[PDB]
Symmetry: C2
Subunit: 272 residues, 2 copies
């Protein structure tokens, strides 16, 4: 399985499944009417947890009946595998989703469906982003659970394709940037609007060398610098601050931002 | 105006404006019920064109009544300006949108609103993407009208902030990547359900040195290379083909793909092919 497709999982399957009578009745009876938009800590998440196996079977049968188009993930994945001429034996699909019951439900069903079509896959889960405060931990978790994995598949010699169709814009833009810095080969997207897969312009990128050097410098001195030290090292902290790379935590001090630390520790080395 | 915000313009304003009964009536009477979803060549585009002044005033007053939240563009822009503490005197907002009447209508209204708030701004138009064929020309046009503009603002010593809130996912992902390659300073995003904008991790990026060198090499040899020649230059054409950077032309040759040449214009200058 030298060809990895990476895809977020959203809840489009949950929403589209409501067009089957048996699914609608079941969801209605369990009190799960807006199950595609539950918040992470809505109590109705527990109804999904409590009924997980039965809901999984129910969605799998719907999906078998109605075909790939019920899930934006399966639609784009199978179209792109078709366009790229990837054979089943050579494919591994890496899905990720928030660690919430409604998303895990859709992800597990997609994973099962791919497996019955003879495609190996896995489902990673990541922290919910539900606020500005949780945005940051969410990004760190995407590095840890997704970007790092991309990096490792590249070291194994695999080709990595990023399916940018599913997922909220800010998580997909992160996946695209950090995924390409991790060495992914190609980003693709399926428009519903004209039922075709396109390749987004996705050149191999790296961190600007001058900036990489300034960043590693911070890492050498703990993760903070005085302004005097920055100046002496010829580091324009003003510019790093504008680019959101450092923060002014100090009296005359600059600290490297957490996401930047996580990113260095993920990419160029795994030390301090 | 040393602080530039770049934003796409979509038709969320058109959709949300139908919440006001006076707007709904007016639009309904003109037969413009689905005006937020018109295709580029729908005949109803002309009704928008023909009633432009009227519709513009109507949306501008709706916005005046009901506030910024009716446009995802205005909501995210003004939230970000506020969190960033950018002063009116130092701001310039660069909007872009498809060259269609419904989108130009939203863009013009947004532009006017910003100008009444004392923020100078501009609206560029780009080609519609309506098919696989037009996807590629669409991308080239975004390079020409937007990415190259980012490059120019950077050369003038301005700061560039990319508002990733509005726009279709595929085009904003391109804008974010190529925008950063062009030197943009920060990308930001307003989640609908939050009141605050977030800053997307926007590390300074360049095209990999290794790949820049290989790609420029194609340009020295008339943009095509045989495998034999590529190998002698140490250029792994099968890997470039997987990365969609080259296409196989005939039995034994590889041509640098057109999109890559646009992107090389970031480093070589937009017109480099003419010298």
């Amino acid at each position: 399985m030298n060809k990895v497709h990476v895809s977020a999982v959203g809840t489009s399957l949950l929403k589209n499944s409501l067009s089957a009578d048996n699914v609608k009745k079941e969801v209605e009876d369990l009190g799960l009417k807006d199950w595609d938009r539950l918040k992470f800590d809505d109590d109705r998440q527990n109804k999904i947890r409590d009924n997980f196996t039965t809901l999984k079977d129910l969605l799998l049968n719907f999906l078998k009946s109605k075909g790939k188009e019920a899930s934006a993930e399966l639609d784009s994945l199978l179209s792109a595998i078709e366009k790229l001429q990837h054979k089943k034996e050579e494919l591994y699909v890496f899905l990720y989703t928030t660690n919430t019951w409604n998303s895990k439900l859709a992800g597990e069903v997609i994973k099962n469906y791919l497996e019955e079509e003879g495609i190996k896959s896995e489902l990673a889960t990541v922290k919910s982003i539900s606020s500005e405060e949780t945005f940051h931990e969410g990004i760190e978790d995407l590095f840890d659970k997704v970007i790092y994995k991309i990096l490792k598949f590249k070291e194994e010699g695999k080709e990595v394709y990023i399916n940018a169709t599913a997922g909220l814009k800010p998580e997909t833009t992160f996946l695209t940037l950090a995924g390409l810095l991790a060495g992914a080969d190609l980003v693709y997207y399926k428009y519903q609007e004209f039922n075709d897969v396109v390749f987004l312009p996705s050149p191999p990128i790296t961190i600007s060398p001058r900036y990489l050097e300034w960043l590693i410098e911070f890492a050498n001195y703990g993760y903070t610098l005085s302004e005097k030290k920055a100046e002496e090292l010829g580091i324009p902290v003003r510019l790093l601050e504008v680019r959101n790379l450092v923060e002014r935590k100090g009296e005359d001090a600059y600290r490297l931002k957490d996401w930047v630390r996580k990113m260095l520790g993920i990419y160029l080395g795994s030390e301090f």
